[PDB]
Amino acid sequence: MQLVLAAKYIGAAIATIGLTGAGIGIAIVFAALINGTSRNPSLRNTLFPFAILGFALSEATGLFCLMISFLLLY
Amino acid sequence: MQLVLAAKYIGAAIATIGLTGAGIGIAIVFAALINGTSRNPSLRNTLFPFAILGFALSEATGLFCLMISFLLLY
Amino acid sequence: MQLVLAAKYIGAAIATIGLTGAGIGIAIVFAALINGTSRNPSLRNTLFPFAILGFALSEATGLFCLMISFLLL
Amino acid sequence: MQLVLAAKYIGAAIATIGLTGAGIGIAIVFAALINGTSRNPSLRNTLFPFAILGFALSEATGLFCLMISFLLL
Amino acid sequence: QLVLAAKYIGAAIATIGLTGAGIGIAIVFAALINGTSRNPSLRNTLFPFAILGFALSEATGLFCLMISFLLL
Amino acid sequence: LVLAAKYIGAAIATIGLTGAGIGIAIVFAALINGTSRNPSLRNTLFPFAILGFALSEATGLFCLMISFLLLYG
Amino acid sequence: MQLVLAAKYIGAAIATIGLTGAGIGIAIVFAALINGTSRNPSLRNTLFPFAILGFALSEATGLFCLMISFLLL
Amino acid sequence: QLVLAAKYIGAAIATIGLTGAGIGIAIVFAALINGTSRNPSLRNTLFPFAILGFALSEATGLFCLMISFLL
Amino acid sequence: MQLVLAAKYIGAAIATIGLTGAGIGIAIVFAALINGTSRNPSLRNTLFPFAILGFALSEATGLFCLMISFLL
Amino acid sequence: MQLVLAAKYIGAAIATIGLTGAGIGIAIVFAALINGTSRNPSLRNTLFPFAILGFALSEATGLFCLMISFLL
Amino acid sequence: IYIIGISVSLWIGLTILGLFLNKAVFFSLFVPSGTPLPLVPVLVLIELLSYTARAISLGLRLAANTLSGHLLMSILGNLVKIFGLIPLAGIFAIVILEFAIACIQAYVFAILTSSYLKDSIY
Amino acid sequence: KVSLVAPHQAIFTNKEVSQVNLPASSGEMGVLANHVPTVEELAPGVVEVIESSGTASKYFVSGGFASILPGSKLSISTVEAHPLDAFSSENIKSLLAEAQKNASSADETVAAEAAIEIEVLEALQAAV
DSSP states (O other): OHHHHHHHHHHHHHGGGGHHHHHHHHHHHHHHHHHHHTTSSOOSSTHHHHHHHHHHHHTHHHHHHHHHHHHHTO | OTHHHHHHHHHHHHGGGGHHHHHHHHHHHHHHHHHHGGGSOOOSSTHHHHHHHHHHHHTHHHHHHHHHHHHHTO | OHHHHHHHHHHHHHGGGGHHHHHHHHHHHHHHHHHHHTTSOOOSSTHHHHHHHHHHHHTHHHHHHHHHHHHTO | OHHHHHHHHHHHHHGGGGHHHHHHHHHHHHHHHHHHHTTSSOOSSTHHHHHHHHHHHHTHHHHHHHHHHHHTO | OHHHHHHHHTTTGGGGGHHHHHHHHHHHHHHHHHHHTTSOOOSSTHHHHHHHHHHHHTHHHHHHHHHHHHTO | OHHHHHHHHHHHGGGGHHHHHHHHHHHHHHHHHHHTTSOOOSSTHHHHHHHHHHHHTHHHHHHHHHHHHHHHO | OHHHHHHHHHHHHHGGGGHHHHHHHHHHHHHHHHHHHTTSOOOSSTTHHHHHHHHHHHTHHHHHHHHHHHHTO | OHHHHHHHHHHHGGGGGHHHHHHHHHHHHHHHHHHHTTSOOOSSTHHHHHHHHHHHHTHHHHHHHHHHHTO | OHHHHHHHHHHHHHGGGGHHHHHHHHHHHHHHHHHHTTSSSOSSSTHHHHHHHHHHHHTHHHHHHHHHHHTO | OHHHHHHHHHHHHHGGGGHHHHHHHHHHHHHHHHTTTTSSSOSSSTHHHHHHHHHHHHTHHHHHHHHHHHOO | OHHHHHHHHHHHHHHHHHHHHHHTSSSOOOOOOOSSOOOOSSOOOSTHHHHHHHHHHHHHHHHHHHHHHTTHHHHHHHHTOOOTHHHHHHHHHHHHHHHHHHHHHHHHHHHHHHHHHHHHTO | OBOOBOSSOBSSOSSOOSEEEEEBSSSEEEEOSSOOOOOEEEOSSEEEEEOTTTOOEEEEEOOEEEEEETTTEEEEEESOEEEGGGOOHHHHHHHHHHHHHHTTSSSTTHHHHHHHHHHHHHHHHSOO
């Protein structure tokens, strides 16, 4: 089974291309929250609650893409 | 087999390239909602209804692309 | 038909690269509508009709590119 | 023969890479029109003619690139 | 064999330039629609630069499509 | 192998058209938005748009010469 | 073992394509913090907690993608 | 035939770097055209930074095109 | 070996594609530092410690990706 | 060695794709410096030191990626 | 822990889909209004389809967090063979980020369930 | 170096200041030694001016136009500028309760004037 072993190693590395959208997504939500907190006056909660929920939704694309890469090599 | 099994494993990895548009879409809608809520006072509904409905439309691209990748490996 | 069978599975995977433009289009149209509605007072109609019609035009690329991938499987 | 049949399936996959420019182009023109309509008073006509004509010109890249993929499949 | 299989690949990878030509018509239309509401660039003035600028940006899509149709 | 590599050389080299196509729209967006600020009309911004577009279009003409030479010479 | 050795070298290079999202993520959070600190006076604490915590969340994509490349080499 | 087939692909994939060199010449000219209308960066001043800035961004395209045409 | 020597040259070339993220990272911090220093006074202080510390974090992606290319 | 000579020419082409980050990086620092020098204040100091030091850091990715492409 | 996390997350997703179907039987089913157009029934990637994707985020986060903690076996052999103090400082930041990720993951489940309960009664 | 001149008295007058943070329309920006020329509208917030050390004087401005010159000069022209200790907590609750009940209760400019008074009274009561 030389064809199945060679395709399993390349599948885990080609599926890691989706980390650019998940990695830059956490910085996009943090850039608007840092620049908006100094504009008065949402600090405790308010705008702080949307940053925690928005970062978890953007990170779901990287967690779902990593499961298909680890299943082909295990 | 042989060529059919190797093409099925490589198809699930190349189809995961579409996660960059769906992953960054959740951060683009959250950046405009967090920066726009500081103008007083888009809190209850109004901006909350457009952010929840807009996130479901952007997440439909990542869920539809993941179904074609999981069907080829199972 | 060994070469045609292996090319059918890889053809449906490389054709799904167009989801980045269609997926980000739904968020780009919603970012201008959410930030523009708080400027008093783009709410009822006016900007509401352009958001529903503009989202359907940007989502046509994702549905058209997905038809070629399902037809080659 | 066998080499020409396998290249026909891959020809319609790599040619669909142009959907990112045509899909995001329909949302870029709608984002500036929705945020600009609430600035008093680009509503009736004026900016309505450039938004309808500009959306058809930006969508021509997706229809022209899709013709080469369907002709080789 | 080798020459016939390479003809289909010459029109697939060459069509990747549609992203620059497709987004170019939208970038010029976004600045013209947002700038026309500032009073009062309507007839001519800004309409001549948007019409001439769209034809120059669309030349990349027509030139790249000529090499794809000549080999397919 | 020599004849098959000449057809793929004119297709992979066409990936540089994204910078030349978007460059003509980036320079035209700043000139159209700056002309409505009173009163960059005669010359000034109009004369720099013709000379500035030649520098951005030089990358597309130089990249197209390498792709056309592999299919003819 | 020629097929396993050739695919192992390509896995470490194909998995390194994700460094663009992790490298630009540290600069995107630093650009908004540098421009906001000059407006006075979110410097000591206050806004310093979101910039330190935001850089660690964006760096998780680069560390997780690098573990799959080192394990296959 | 393996050495002759690799020479054609060495100049095609290397031409992908023209996106940064093509868009870089227009990004520097867009900021100079929008800033010159603010009164009165016309003669010199902004003209020296735009001419020197365009030559530094164009060095990446001339260096990448030398390795592709040397095959 | 012929298969081991061909994969080593392709590994160093595919790993060099990550320079776009490291090159644009140093320019992103330099663009905000040049525009932010005009407001005064974050040139010699304030933003001076953030520009030196922020450039070292963005440069870690280029040094780690270049180590796997030279070792293959 | 036909396989070793085929991978040597392909190594200089895939490694040259990193010029997009180095080419657009020098223009991002020059666009923010030209638009900030026209108002508060000059261009002979302050922003002059950041533009010269910022362009040398972003250009290091293009010189490091070109050495691995010419040596293969 | 990996097999118990995927089975417990699948049972919570069925309760969100079953509760929305019961509330949409005594007061009709309005949901989306519209804007004099159509093509709304083909995009049914929410409500019922959103429960399979939201519940999968809890199981996928446990596999990614366990992979970073289990990577210390490969780094311990190189440090016991520059100084080895760089591995101790880097492992402390990953342990603090993994423990703090549980609060963000638990808050995402409560925020997702709040939008489904409010939309089912409107 | 500030020029906080109101329409009743002079606060800064002469150039003898260091830092000053005033709430503008976009955000809570603060002027340093020699700020750039960014003449923006001032919202109804707190205009604190730090005097060298911790000798800042919190002045609750009613809104104006914080104009900044290119020669190290900051002209903060406002209609009313009073300190935070010149307001009572019992008398401030009567005006905020009357503006909320009068909003969306009539026509003409009666309902529009009550919405602006309720937003300015809520921001001053939270900064005590």
